[PDB]
Amino acid sequence: GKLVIWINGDKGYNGLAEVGKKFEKDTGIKVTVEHPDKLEEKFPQVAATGDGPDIIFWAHDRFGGYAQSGLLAEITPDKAFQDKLYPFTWDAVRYNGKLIAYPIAVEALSLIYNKDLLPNPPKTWEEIPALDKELKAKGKSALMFNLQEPYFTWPLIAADGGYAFKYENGKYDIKDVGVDNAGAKAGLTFLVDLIKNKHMNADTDYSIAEAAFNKGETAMTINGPWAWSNIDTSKVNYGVTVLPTFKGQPSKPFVGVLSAGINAASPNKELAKEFLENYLLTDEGLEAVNKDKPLGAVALKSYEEELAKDPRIAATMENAQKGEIMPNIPQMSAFWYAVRTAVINAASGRQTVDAALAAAQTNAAAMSLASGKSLLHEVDKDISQLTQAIVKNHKNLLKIAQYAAQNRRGLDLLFWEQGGLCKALQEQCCFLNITNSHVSILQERPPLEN
Amino acid sequence: GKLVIWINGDKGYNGLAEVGKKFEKDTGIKVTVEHPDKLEEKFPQVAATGDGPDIIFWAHDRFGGYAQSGLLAEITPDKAFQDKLYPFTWDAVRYNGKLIAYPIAVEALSLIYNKDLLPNPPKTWEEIPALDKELKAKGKSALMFNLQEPYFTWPLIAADGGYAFKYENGKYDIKDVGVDNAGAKAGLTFLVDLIKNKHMNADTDYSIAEAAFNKGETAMTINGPWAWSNIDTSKVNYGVTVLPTFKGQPSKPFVGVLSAGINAASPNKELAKEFLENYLLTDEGLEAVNKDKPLGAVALKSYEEELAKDPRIAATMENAQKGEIMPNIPQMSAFWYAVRTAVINAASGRQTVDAALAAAQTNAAAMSLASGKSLLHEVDKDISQLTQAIVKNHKNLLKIAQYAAQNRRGLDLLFWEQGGLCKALQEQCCFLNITNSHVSILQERPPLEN
Amino acid sequence: GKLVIWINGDKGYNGLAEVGKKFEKDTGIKVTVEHPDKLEEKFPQVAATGDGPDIIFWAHDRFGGYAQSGLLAEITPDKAFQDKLYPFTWDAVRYNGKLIAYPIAVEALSLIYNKDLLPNPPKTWEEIPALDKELKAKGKSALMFNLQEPYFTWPLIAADGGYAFKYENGKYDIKDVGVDNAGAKAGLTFLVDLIKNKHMNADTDYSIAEAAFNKGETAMTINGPWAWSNIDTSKVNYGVTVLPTFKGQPSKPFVGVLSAGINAASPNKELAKEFLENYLLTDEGLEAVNKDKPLGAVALKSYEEELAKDPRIAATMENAQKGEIMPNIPQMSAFWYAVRTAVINAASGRQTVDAALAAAQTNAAAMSLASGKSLLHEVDKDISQLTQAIVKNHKNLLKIAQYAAQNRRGLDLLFWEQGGLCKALQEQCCFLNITNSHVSILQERPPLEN
Ligand SMILES: OC[C@H]1O[C@H](O[C@H]2[C@H](O)[C@@H](O)[C@@H](O)O[C@@H]2CO)[C@H](O)[C@@H](O)[C@@H]1O
Ligand SMILES: OC[C@H]1O[C@H](O[C@H]2[C@H](O)[C@@H](O)[C@@H](O)O[C@@H]2CO)[C@H](O)[C@@H](O)[C@@H]1O
C-alpha cells in the first residue's frame, strides 16, 4: 500500500524525491526512491522473488529481458496519453508487440571539453594522441573517461563499422552480430593503442575520469546529461559538442531511452501508473528531476521544445542522430557482457584486439554438454583436492591435540597436590572436544557427474 | 545367466516377485526384483557402465532418452503377440520408429475422496478452498497430495491451457513448449493461492499425503491405482472419480504406460523377452502383480475387459481420456525437471508464478560459452578462496605445533631425571609429524580457464 | 625482431633446427625451435595473449579454430609459389575461403610389422586375435599402439562406416555426425573385444607401444613416418604396408597435412613468410627435417617425386588414399575430444561401446541453462560443505591454541624464577597469533546463482 522507485545513483534521484513528495501530500501515498549499485542486476534477482521496487528505472535495452523473465507488468497508456510523448521513444519501450515501460528521456553520450584549456576541440579521434602530448607537457592530459563500461568506448567501436545485431527487415537478427568485423577491430585497436601509448590508462573508471575533468586535470571527457550538473558545481567552463570522428566516420553511440517499468509483483500497480502518467511525465515533474541531474532529450513533447534549444541538448541529439537506437531483445545483457570483457581484456592486455573481439562473437553461441561435462569433471579433480587438503588438516589437528593432552597430563602430575593444572592456575579449565563431521560428509561426497 | 528386474517401490513388486517364481521353477532361471529410490535416475547411470537390471520398469515417457543414450535393446514382439496388447500402448513404447519397451499398463491420476467424510465430492477446483474451511473447523482438511513431483500438480497446470510440447502433424515440436502461457499461470497461481491461503502445505509429499488420507485426516487426495491397495488395508471408505475442473476446464492429467525395457548391456536378452512375453504379459501374470498394487488399465486386452468394468478403473480411463499421452522424446527429463523447479519454487515462495513459469521455458534453451565461462571464472574466485583459507589453516596448525613442541621441551627438562615427559608418564610418546602435501598442490593449481 | 617456431616433439625438430641455421647466417635472424607437450592446446592459450611462437606447426584440422579464434594471420603465397606445392594440400589449409597456413607434408597412419617375427602380415583385423595367441606363446605379442589418442583407433572406427561430419555438396554438415552408427559400433566393439580378450592393454600409449615394437616385444604397430627414424636406429627389420581390413572394409585413416601457421600477434610476419616460402619449403629444407623424422608425402612437388618411389611412402599414400581428408572446421577439437572420451571409456570399461559412442554424438549439442543452473546450484551444495569443514577446522585450531596457551601458563609458573618457559630454555619464544580472515570471507560468500 506504499510505493518504491529504483533509479541509478548517477541520475537525478533527489529531484525525483521531490516529485515523490508532490505525490505523497496530494495523494497521501508515501513514495520512496532508492539507488543501489549494480541496479540492473539486482532488480531481476529481487524482483524474481516478488520483492524489489514497484517501479524500476533503467535504459530500455534491458527491459525486454525483464519482460522475457516475466518481471514487469504491461503498462496501459490511454491512446491519448501516448501522444503526449514522442512516438519513437514509445517503440523503444515496446516488447513482443506490447508496452512494458514508460519512456522518460533519450540519452546519447557526447564530447565534453574544458574550453579554458582547449578553446577548440578535436574533430577527429586520430589527433588526440598528439594533442595529449602538448598537454602532458603542461601537467594535464587530453581525454579521460570510464573504461569499465562498454557503453563509452562502444561509440568508437561502432564508428568504423561495428554493430550489435543487424536489423534485417524490422527484425534484429541474433545470428547476425558484428562485434568482430573490420570496423570493430579498427576502433578497438586504436583505443587500445591510446592506452598502449600512455595517452590513456585502463584501471580508469567513472569516478576517476569524472573527478579529473572536474578538477581540471584533463581537457576532454565523454558522458551524458546527468554529468553536466557536477561540472557546473565545479566552476569549470565546459562545452558539449559532437563526438570525434574515426577514419572519417562519426562515432556511432548507442542511444537509450531511460524508462520506468512496473514490477509485475507489484500490488500498487495503479499507484505507479498514476505517479508516472500524471505526476512524473509532466512538464513540472520532468523539470524537478532535471534540476537534480539533466535527463537529456525528455520524451514529453512540451518539455523537449524548450530543452532542445539548448546547445548541450542539441549536440546530444546530433550525437544520437549519428548513433543507433539500442535493441530491446533479451540478448542485450549477453551482448553487453561480451563487449565489457573484450574491452577490458584488450585494454588490460590480457587479450589481443583480434582475440578478444573474436571471443565476444564466437561465445555468443551454445556450449556443448561436453564442455559442461569437461567443466564438470574438471571441477571435480578440483573439489576433491580441496577435500584431502581439508581432511589432512583435520588429522594433523588431532595429532596436535593428543600431543597437547599428553603434555597437559604431565603437568597435572607436577601440580598434583594442587588439583592438576587448571586448579593451580585457579582458572576455567580448557577442553579439547574436537570433531569435524563434514570431514566424513565430504568423503562420501558422490561424484559431480550426477 | 540369471535375470534381474527393477521396478518402482511404489508399485506391485512383491506381486511381480511371485510371477518371478513361476518363471524360476518352470524354467529354472532365478528372477530377482529390486526397487531403489530415484530409479529413473539410477538406471541410466548403472546401465551406462554395463551394470544394472536386465529389465527396467518405468513409464514410457523417459525410455526415448534411455534409447537415445543407447541403453536398451529393441524388443522383437512377433506380429501376433502385438495383437494381444492394445495398439495405442504399443505406440507409447515405440521410439525412432522402433520398439524399445513392453507396455504393461496405462496409468492416469484420479480423485480419491473419503465417502465417510465427504459423501459428495467437489466437481470444481475453485470450491476446495471454502470446503477446506468447513473441515478445518472439524479438525481435518479437504485435499492433500504429493507436491514434490510435477506429475500431480501438472493436471491442474494443463487444465486451463498448459502443455509440454505441441504435437504438430504427428510430430512433437521441441521449440514449441507451453509451460508459460495463460492457462499455465492460471493453474499454478490457483494452486499456490491454495497454499498461500493455508489450505495446503508445501513441505508436503507422498508419504505425508498418503498417511493423512489413510488416517482419515483429510477428505481428498490425488493418486493412481497403485495407491488403492493401502487404502483398502486402512478400512477407509474411499471413492475414485474424475478430477475437479478448473475454470470450467477438466484437469488434463499426463498419462503414462508403465513399461518394461531390456538393458542393451544384457546377456539374458531372450530370458527377458520370454519372461515378459510368456510369463508377465499373461492374464495370470498381470493378476499376481495386481493383487499387490493395482496396475490400472493393463495393456493385455483379455485382462482389461474384466478390469474396465470396475469404477476405479472406469474413472481412471475417463481421467486419461480427459488428459494427454506423455511424449517419448528424450526432452522429457528436462521438461519434467523444469516443472519440478517451477512448482517447488512457486509454492515455496522462492519464486513467483510468473517468474518461475518463465524460467521453465526460457531455460529449456542453450547457454552461451560466455555463461559457461562466466560460471567458470566465477567458481575460480571461489575455489581459490577456499584454498587460501585451507592454506592458512595449515600454517596456524604449524604455529601451534611448534608452540606445543616448545612447551614439551620445558617439560622434558622438568622430568629430566625421569627420561623426559613420555618416560615419566610411562606411556607411548606422541609425535608431531605434520605435513600437508595438497597444500602446495592446491597452490600450483592451474586456472580453471583451461 | 627474432623468430620462434613450435613443432611437435614427435616430429623432426632438430632437423628443422638445422634449416633454422641456414636462415640465421644467410639472413642474420636467430631462429629457435620449441616442442612443448599439449602443443595444440598451449598455443591457442599463449597466442591469445599475444605471446607464443611466430610460427606454429600442427595438422591442418585444428587451424580453422585458431583462425576462428583469430589467432593467425592469412598467408600471402604468390600465385606462382602456390604451384610449387600440390593443390590438394593447399585446400587442406584454406579456411573461410582464405589461406591460413603453409602445408608442409601429408601424413597417414600405416601398418608397421617386424618382418623378422612376422614375414607375412595380417591382411585383416579379424585375425590378429588368433595370431596374438601364437606369439603370446612365444613370449611376445602381435599388435601394439597408442590407445590414448583417437587418431590411431579411428581408422578402425571409420573402416566399417564411422565418420566425423558428412561432406554434403562441398560443405561439411555439423548436424550430420556419424560417430554412433553401425560401422562405428562394429569397429569399437571389436577393438574393445581385443582388450577384453587380453590381446591388448588399455593403459597403453605411445612411448609404451613404441618401446615395445622397437625392443622386438611385439610384431605389429600403427604409426606415421616420424616413427620410422627410431626403428631404423633400433636395427629391427620392419615393413610398412597397408592397414588391415575390417569386415572386408579397409581401415579408413584420417589424413592430415602438417602445416605452419603465422601467429597473428607476430611482428616478424614477413620473416616467417620468407623462412617458410624460401627456406623451409625447398627441396633442401624439407630434406634436412626429413633426415631427422620422416615427414611423409611432402607437399613440394619436386621432393615428392623422389620420395613417392619409396615403399614406406607408397604405402602411406595408399593408406591416405583409403582414408579421408580431415575437415578444417573449428568443430574438430570437440569432435576429437568426443572420440577420445568414447575410446578411453569403452576400452577402460567405464562405458559400453553403445553408451560411449552415443554420448559422443548427443553431447556434441547444446546444454540447457537448466543443466548449467542445476550444475551451478549443485557445485554450491558442494563449495558450501567445504566451507563449514574449513570453518570447523579453524575453530578446533583455536580450541587447541587456547588449550596450549593455558598449559604454557602453568609452565611459566613452574619456571617463574627463571623468567617463565622461554627464558629457562634460553630460546626464541613462540607465538600463537592465530587469524584466518578467509574464514569470514567464505561465510559471507554470496550464492553462486549470481
Ligand atoms: O556499459 C553497458 C551498459 O550500457 C548502458 O547503460 C548506460 C545507461 O543507459 C546510461 O543511462 C548510464 O546510466 O550509464 C550506463 C552505463 O554505465 C545500457 O543501458 C546497460 O544495460 C548496459 O549494461
Ligand atoms: O513428477 C515427474 C515424473 O512423472 C512421471 O512419473 C510418475 C510415474 O509415471 C507413475 O507411474 C508414478 O510412479 O509416479 C511418478 C511420479 O512420482 C514420469 O513418468 C516420470 O518420468 C517423471 O519424472
Ligand SMILES: OC[C@H]1O[C@H](O[C@H]2[C@H](O)[C@@H](O)[C@@H](O)O[C@@H]2CO)[C@H](O)[C@@H](O)[C@@H]1O
Ligand atoms: O588423436 C587426436 C589428434 O589427432 C590428430 O593429431 C595427430 C597429428 O596429426 C599427427 O601429425 C601426430 O602428431 O599425432 C597426432 C595424434 O597424437 C589431429 O591432427 C589432432 O588435432 C587431434 O587432437
Ligand SMILES: [Cl-]
Ligand atoms: Cl601444549
Ligand SMILES: [Cl-]
Ligand atoms: Cl581446512
